[PDB]
Amino acid sequence: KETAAAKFERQHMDSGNSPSSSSNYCNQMMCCRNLTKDRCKPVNTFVHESLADVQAVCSQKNVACKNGQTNCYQSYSTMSITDCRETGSSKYPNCAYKTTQANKHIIVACEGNPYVPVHFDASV
Template sequence: MGLEKSLMLFPLLVLVLGLVQPSLGRESSAMKFERQHMDSAGTGSSPTYCNQMMMRREMTNGSCKPVNTFVHEPLAHVHAACSQKNVTCKNGKGNCYKSSSALHITDCRLKGNSKYPNCDYQTSNYQKRIIVACEGNPYVPVHLDASV
């Protein structure tokens, strides 16, 4: 009888695991934001910083991401932007917010003659405010919309 129950429950277990498993390895939007944009410990001062970081953060897999910005501030400072004055995002959505102060950032721009797999980036450092799109509960950055 115990074996019969186990055999009856097995298909149900397979169904549940099939539904749950794909989401286990999926990167959340907030985690992707951190991977692509946060480097609290870095300074971005090396001319090869962007080449190294874009590769390390998996933004040169299959193609070269044309533009990316790294923020060199504590994550809490970036999260704080989500409680600032609301601004319209570039895509017209209303979930963007501008940081209250300028932050240390590094812009990485793909050089014109650069082609995959040899992605070559120009590294530029700035002190600028950032505009981030925020979502979720807790309300956290999920997209870096601009630096101004």
């Protein structure tokens, strides 16, 4: 009763579901980190490397910040990160986001003592 054609579909078709597919990760983190409190923050990037590895970036590759400042640093290695972007249905107070995974070099602005990140400037 299962046709050869249906068997191929069962064994091999999983449209729109690569392990890469979006999920509600951004919706949960965006909300729980208070990023949708007075507005839907439009875009945000979460970093999954350890804090020690991210802090180390402040003494890695020195580059210009988007705003022209020069206290930004790009990580020597690519880092595991997740980009959060608002979806078509997002409208405060009901924010909604698409989750996109990635592995890129991060660029952060750093200041203070200890010299640590205070701004996520971009990913490359």
